[PDB]
Design a protein around this motif. Sequence first.
Motif, mmCIF file in Angstrom:
data_model
loop_
_atom_site.group_PDB
_atom_site.id
_atom_site.type_symbol
_atom_site.label_atom_id
_atom_site.label_comp_id
_atom_site.label_asym_id
_atom_site.label_seq_id
_atom_site.Cartn_x
_atom_site.Cartn_y
_atom_site.Cartn_z
ATOM 1 N N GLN A 20 0.804 -1.227 0.000
ATOM 2 C CA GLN A 20 0.000 0.000 0.000
ATOM 3 C C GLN A 20 0.845 1.290 0.000
ATOM 4 N N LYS A 21 2.167 1.149 0.087
ATOM 5 C CA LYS A 21 3.080 2.289 0.102
ATOM 6 C C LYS A 21 2.745 3.257 1.245
ATOM 7 N N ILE A 22 2.489 2.686 2.419
ATOM 8 C CA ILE A 22 2.111 3.479 3.609
ATOM 9 C C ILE A 22 3.349 4.094 4.216
ATOM 10 N N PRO A 23 3.403 5.440 4.382
ATOM 11 C CA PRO A 23 4.611 6.073 4.948
ATOM 12 C C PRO A 23 4.933 5.723 6.382
ATOM 13 N N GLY A 24 3.925 5.611 7.228
ATOM 14 C CA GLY A 24 4.093 5.430 8.655
ATOM 15 C C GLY A 24 2.862 4.706 9.203
ATOM 16 N N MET A 25 3.083 3.865 10.201
ATOM 17 C CA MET A 25 1.966 3.125 10.748
ATOM 18 C C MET A 25 2.230 2.791 12.201
ATOM 19 N N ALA A 26 1.166 2.773 13.000
ATOM 20 C CA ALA A 26 1.285 2.271 14.379
ATOM 21 C C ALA A 26 0.197 1.249 14.598
ATOM 22 N N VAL A 27 0.510 0.192 15.336
ATOM 23 C CA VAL A 27 -0.503 -0.805 15.629
ATOM 24 C C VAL A 27 -0.473 -1.142 17.099
ATOM 25 N N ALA A 28 -1.647 -1.396 17.693
ATOM 26 C CA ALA A 28 -1.682 -1.936 19.063
ATOM 27 C C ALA A 28 -2.548 -3.166 19.019
ATOM 28 N N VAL A 29 -2.072 -4.238 19.656
ATOM 29 C CA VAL A 29 -2.880 -5.431 19.824
ATOM 30 C C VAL A 29 -3.151 -5.509 21.321
ATOM 31 N N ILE A 30 -4.410 -5.713 21.661
ATOM 32 C CA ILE A 30 -4.833 -5.903 23.025
ATOM 33 C C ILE A 30 -5.094 -7.382 23.139
ATOM 34 N N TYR A 31 -4.312 -8.039 23.994
ATOM 35 C CA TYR A 31 -4.337 -9.486 24.118
ATOM 36 C C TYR A 31 -4.505 -9.827 25.572
ATOM 37 N N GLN A 32 -5.518 -10.632 25.885
ATOM 38 C CA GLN A 32 -5.881 -10.873 27.292
ATOM 39 C C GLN A 32 -5.940 -9.548 28.062
ATOM 40 N N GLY A 33 -6.429 -8.514 27.387
ATOM 41 C CA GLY A 33 -6.595 -7.224 28.035
ATOM 42 C C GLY A 33 -5.380 -6.316 28.148
ATOM 43 N N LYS A 34 -4.202 -6.766 27.702
ATOM 44 C CA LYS A 34 -2.978 -5.969 27.830
ATOM 45 C C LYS A 34 -2.563 -5.457 26.452
ATOM 46 N N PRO A 35 -1.995 -4.235 26.368
ATOM 47 C CA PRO A 35 -1.649 -3.716 25.037
ATOM 48 C C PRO A 35 -0.202 -3.981 24.679
#
Length: 358
Positions: A20-35
Motif C-alpha cells: 500500500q506504500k504506507i509512509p508510517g503506521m502504528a498498531v496496538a494489539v490488546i491481548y488478554q486485556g494488555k496492550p
Amino acid sequence: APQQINDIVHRTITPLIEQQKIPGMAVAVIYQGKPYYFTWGYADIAKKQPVTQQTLFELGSVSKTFTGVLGGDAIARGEIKLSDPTTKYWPELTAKQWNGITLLHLATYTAGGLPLQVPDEVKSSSDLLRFYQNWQPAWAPGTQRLYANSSIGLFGALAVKPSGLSFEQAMQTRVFQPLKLNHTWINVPPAEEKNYAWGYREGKAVHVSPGALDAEAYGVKSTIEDMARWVQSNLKPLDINEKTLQQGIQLAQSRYWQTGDMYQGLGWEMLDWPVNPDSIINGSDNKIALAARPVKAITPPTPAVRASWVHKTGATGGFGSYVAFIPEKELGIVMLANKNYPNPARVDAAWQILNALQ
Ligand SMILES: *[B]([O])([O])C1=[C]N(C2=[C]C(Cl)=N[C]=N2)N=[C]1
C-alpha cells in the motif's frame, strides 16, 4: 510482546505497508486485556521524524465512536433520550419533514437520506439551520441506512445541548479525562504539534481542513497508546468507575438496526462472532459501506453482545484507521496510518492478526 503476537503482527503488517506504500503506521494489539505496540516508518517524511507511540494520527470516522459514546453518556445522565424528536433540542427546526425524526435516527444514519457530507458551502450556524430546514428525505425515517456525517454529526451537536457544554468541552470532561486519554484531541494544542503526523495524499503532506460538524463526525486525533486504552475501555466497560460513562459505552454497542449481517450501534458497528471474514472484509469496501440499504429495526435494541466483532473504519484525505475488538475474547486491534488506503486491506490484516490470536 510474546513471540506469537510479534510474529503474526510483523508477518501481516510488513507486506501491507509495502503493498500500500504506507509512509508510517502504528498498531496496538490488546491481548488478554494488555496492550502491545508496534511502529513503522515516518510521521513526517520531509523532516525524517519516525512514528512513535506518542505520534498523533487523524482518526477520521473512528471519531464517530467517541461521539456515539458521548451521546450514550448523555442518555445515561438523563439529559437526552434517543426517542426524543430532533426538534426538542433544536426548536428552530420547524420544517414538517422533521416530524417523526428522532435522535435515534440521527445517531444511526436512518433519518431518511441525510447526505454523507455537509456541503462545503455551509459554514455558519445559520447556514447549517438553512441546510437542515431545506433538506428533503428520500425515505420515511427508520427504513433505510445511509452512512452520513450530516446525520451522526447533528446527533453529537444536539446530544450535548442540555449540558450547556461545547461539544469539545463535553468530550474532554466526560470521555477523554475519565478514561485518561491525555493525548487525544479535537484540536491539537501547540505543545503537541511536534507529535502530529502529516497525512500523505498523492505524495503531498496534508492535514484535515475545518468543516461543519467536523469535531462530531471525523475530527479526533490520537496516539496509539490512547487508542489502545479506548479499546480496553470498550472491551470492559464494567471496569470504568464513572457510572454514566460505563452505561454510555454499553449503549453505544447496543444493536439498533440490522442490514445483512451487520448491526448498527452508536458509532460502532457490530457483527456476531465468529464472523465470516469475507463478510467484514468485503463489507468494509466503500461500495457497500456508503450505499443506501434497507434496515430492519431491532425492537427493542439488543444490549451489548459480548460475542461480537465490534469495529469502525476511519479515513481523512491523508490518513487511514481501523479499530476492532471482540469482548468475549478480551482481544482487539488498532491500526493507524498516515495514508488513506483501501478499507478491505485494513480489515483483512486485522482479521489475519486477531484470528491467529483468538
Ligand atoms: B469517515 O468515514 O472516515 C469520514 C471522514 N470524512 C471526512 C470529510 C471531510 Cl469534509 N474531511 C475529512 N474527512 N467523511 C467521512
